Amino acid sequence: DPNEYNEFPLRAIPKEDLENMRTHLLKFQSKKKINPVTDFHLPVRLHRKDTRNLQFQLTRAEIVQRQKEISLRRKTRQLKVLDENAKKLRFEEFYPWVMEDFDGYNTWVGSYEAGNSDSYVLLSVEDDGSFTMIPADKVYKFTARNKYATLTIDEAEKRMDKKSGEVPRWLMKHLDNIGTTTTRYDRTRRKLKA
Amino acid sequence: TLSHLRRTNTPIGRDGKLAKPRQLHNTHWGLVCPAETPEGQACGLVKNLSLMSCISVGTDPMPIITFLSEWGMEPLEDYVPHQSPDATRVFVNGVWHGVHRNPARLMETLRTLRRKGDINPEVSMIRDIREKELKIFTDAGRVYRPLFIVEDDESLGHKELKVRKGHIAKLMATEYQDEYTWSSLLNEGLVEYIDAEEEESILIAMQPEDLEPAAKRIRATTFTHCEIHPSMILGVAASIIPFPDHNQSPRNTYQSAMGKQAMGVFLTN
Amino acid sequence: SFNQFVDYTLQDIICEDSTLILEQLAQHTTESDNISRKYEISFGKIYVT
Amino acid sequence: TTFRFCRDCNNMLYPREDKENNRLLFECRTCSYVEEAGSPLVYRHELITNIGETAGVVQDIGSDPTLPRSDRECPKCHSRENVFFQSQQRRKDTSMVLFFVCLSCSHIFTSDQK
Amino acid sequence: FDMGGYFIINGSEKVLIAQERSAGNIVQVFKKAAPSPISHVAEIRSALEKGSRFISTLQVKLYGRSSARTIKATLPYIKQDIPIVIIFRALGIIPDGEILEHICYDVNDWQMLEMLKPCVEDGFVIQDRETALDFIGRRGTALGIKKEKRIQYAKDILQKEFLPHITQLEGFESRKAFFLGYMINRLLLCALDRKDQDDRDHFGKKRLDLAGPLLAQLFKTLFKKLTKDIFRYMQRTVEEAHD
Amino acid sequence: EESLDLDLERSNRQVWLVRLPMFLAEKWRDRNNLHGQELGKIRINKDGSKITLLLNENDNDSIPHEYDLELTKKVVENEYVFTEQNLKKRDRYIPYVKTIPKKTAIVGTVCHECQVMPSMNDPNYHKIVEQRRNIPKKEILDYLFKLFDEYDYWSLKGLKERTRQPEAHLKECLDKVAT
Ligand SMILES: [Zn+2]
Ligand SMILES: [Zn+2]
DSSP: OOSOSOOOOOEEOOTTTSTTOOOOEEEEOOSSOOOHHHHSOSOOEEEEOOOTTTTTSOOHHHHHHHHHHHOOOOSOOOOOOOOHHHHHHHHHTTSOEEEEOSSOSSEEEEEEEOSSTTTOEEEEEOSSSOEEEEEOOOEEEEEEOSSSOOOOHHHHHHHHSTTSSSOOTTHHHHHHHHTTTOOHHHHHHHHHHO | OTTTTSEEEOOOOSSOOSTTTTSOOGGGTTTBOSSOOOOSSOBTTBEEBOSSOEEEEOOOSHHHHHHHHHTOOBOGGGOOTTTSSSOEEEESSSOEEEEESOHHHHHHHHHHHHHHTSSOTTOEEEEETTTTEEEEEOOEEEEEEOOEEEESOOTTSSOEESOOHHHHHHHHHHHTTOOOOSHHHHTTTSBOOEESSOGGGOOEESSTTSSOOOOOOOOOOOOOEEOSOGGGGOOHHHHHSSSTTSSOHHHHHHHHHHGGGOOSOOOOO | OHHHHHHSSHHHHHHTTOOEEEEESOSSSOSSSOOOEEEEEOOOOOOOO | OOOOBOSSSOOBOBOOBOSSSOOBEEEOSSSSOEEEOSSSOOOOOOOOOOOOSSOOOOTTGGGSSSSOOOOOOOTTTOOSOOEEEOOSOOOTTOOOOOEEEOSSSOOEEEOOOO | OOOOOOEEOSSOEEOOOEEEEEOSSOOEEEEOOTTSSBOEEEEEOOOSSOGGGOOOOEEEEEEOOOOOOEEEEEOTTOOSOEEHHHHHHHHTOOSHHHHHHHHOSOSSOOHHHHHHHHHHHHTTSOOSHHHHHTSOOOOSSOOOSOSSSOHHHHHHHHHHTSSTTTOOSSOOHHHHHHHHHHHHHHHHHHHHTSSOOOOSSOSTTEEEEOHHHHHHHHHHHHHHHHHHHHHTTTSSTTSSOOO | OOOOSOBOGGGSOEEEEEEOOHHHHHHTTOSSSOSSOOOEEEEOOSSOSOEEEEEOGGGTTSSOSEEEEOOSBSSOOSEEEEEEEOOOOOOOOOSOSSOOOOEEEEEEEEEEEEEEEEOTTSSSTTHHHHHHHHOOHHHHHHHHHHHHHHOSSOOHHHHHHHHOSOHHHHHHHHHTTOO
């Protein structure tokens, strides 16, 4: 063919590089384009944690401000058999992936996809034009969470019960005007002000 | 005995309704004899298969799903209803696996590849094009019966069933040999198994010339199939009824009940 | 139906659930260590006569 | 009557009324986006309908062999071929009006003359 | 001439007869009678060849005839009839219009959207997956190291037991969401009478079993009895020996 | 030891995404392969919309050499691929939940999803379709005096190895002093 194109048949990964890598794939669930290097109040830490009371969990800016202010068996059992790789996957995804900025204004909660993680392969161009083949391992999906001052399970159950024949349409607006269970960005701003 | 080998039996309960399956239904055609029923408290409970009636023994579906993957669908992980407003959902034994853009090519390809013999012919498929759906069934438990295939197009003209005089001459020669079989007719695609579920994509001809060219008794143009013979909707004892059109149906019922109580010979040993 | 069940689904119904182990390391602390005493039983190929 | 969604975040918009400027303002319950309403129509029950006899048409209805064929023509292209079939709605009071779809004009037309 | 597929037990020729049932793993809808509080329902049977009989029934029920337009659903082991927006959020679809895109297909039609708007108002309160999963459905067994109900326990339910077809391993909740959306779609078509009442008495929706499945069932169950007796006497050999 | 954050220079990178049939995916996931050798060739148009794969003769023609690229998703947003290396070695905050953050680097943005399909006109193609279709009284009294001096509630089973004597003699001697 007449060379109107960037022909570079593939180079590949160093095999000695290739041990201790896990190279997953990330997607955001929003129609608007998101670029975290433009959006996030960096530093950005990626951690694998539980999500129990994550709204009640403190932000990293709040942690830094607090640090600155402070400164007979029954001898019979059975392990019904299960796949060791599946168990290792289950223990890996016992906690999911979460990345967020230092402020805690925007936070993103991840989840795991198992539908097509085997067949994919990567054509990432290099600076010279090189195309290294990185065989993908798993694909993960991230959604935003607590961007909008999420509610509480208990009073949620009281709204679910038939105390009202229909709950108020602006009940969330009334609760936000009361100030109960505010946003993570608002809590971080109030903690930074205090 | 040759009646009693091919018996079927459902449980219902004590009293039951009547529109519920105690009485016969139009779906029963070509599969079960509409006369050979027992009499007394269980009429319409026990029922007896057709002559060429054959049962499904199942086949594992993963070569079919990988084949389907290779010939192109969108797997559901990136489905969106807006950008695919009209594509056809794909099912395999009541399981969603694919949505695919071009249904007609996929259907004719699956039909040609079943005819060529690279798929076990027990597998069935329906294009309910009215609802933009597609079905694939491969479990054990279905019932099917043979048919004569028809190509619509013809160099000789109008419309024709594919089988010819030379093939049946070779069948006659192999029978009086005392190397064609039924399977060795099946492999090159002249007959085709069709289950109990497909027929609503199929027009059927009663006779091999009923409208195929374009006093005794009294008797469209888009056929795809004709039966082997209309006499073979019956069962075992129903074969023995001479001229079984030429009576009334409860007489056929008492005859099928009566023939089990006949003496004569049973074996030779 | 009979020939299908004789040829297949029997090796499948064995290999579905053939695994059974009782590996007794120590079942208390020490016993120093003890060894991971793999009492392993499983069924391989089947046979018909 | 449609259900608008907040363009910032694809969530079900709810009606809520201005306190003093007397306008319906569809405010998002997720985010702070708000939008005025084109009409004072909010809710609509529609206890009586008669609809559904027509649709479900694919562009190749006639590709299926099982539909019958006739010789009435399409009153746009005048081609004598056609495909006819009855209502796609099935109530216990739906009519014996017929629907005629052609291949040449690719058009749907009926046989009612009231 | 004795072509005959029978069995010879104790000096007696002995034959088995076919049994039938409805086909499992296939959509049906019913129209229950007027005086009940339920009007339109659905069902899925299941069997996966056939470990502990894999019965695992499902239904989705519908209320009123009026203003009681709500869609609750039942699952094992949940004794409460759970509304379905909770299920969508719990499986991991938060944004409301995407739940609507899972249910319906043509956005131009609207009758389904007025059908679903009271159900979204039911689901207006709970806006997070594990908060949705926090709903109890106790039905046994006893709680482990919990607070009220482990979200790990609820996710273990939704992975292992529910919908014993498309998957039961770990990671295909989007396939589950699409399957439920198709189920809700056909239920709404039966409710709005654009599409008709199904038939139970059609033949192809039934199946016929034979000696293969019958010997499979009995052989599986007596093999489990066997295996529990194999686990028996393995605890009893505290003393010698390996017989 | 090292920095706990993530690399950002490799973010600005277009990535093409390929699905693959299974026999192909087995040969292209060989770690005994994949050292930098070049195994195919590509041919795009000036306007695009038809890209073919010219597979080199390394396959020895058990599979085709003529393949086409099916760019299903020509424009791709928000799809990011990263890497991972393990590290070199009301206001209650838990800085250690035993999370193990890694030397992770976001290393590319997916821009084009595509697929290599075996061009059916090839004679080696559809051959794969038939393949897929086919497939001592006195001393011990002093010794036990030392033993109750060693510990008050000494075990009877522990008394056995400390004596290694006749137990009936031991039982008589134990009854004379204590329990
Ligand atoms: Zn919003
Ligand atoms: Zn016309």
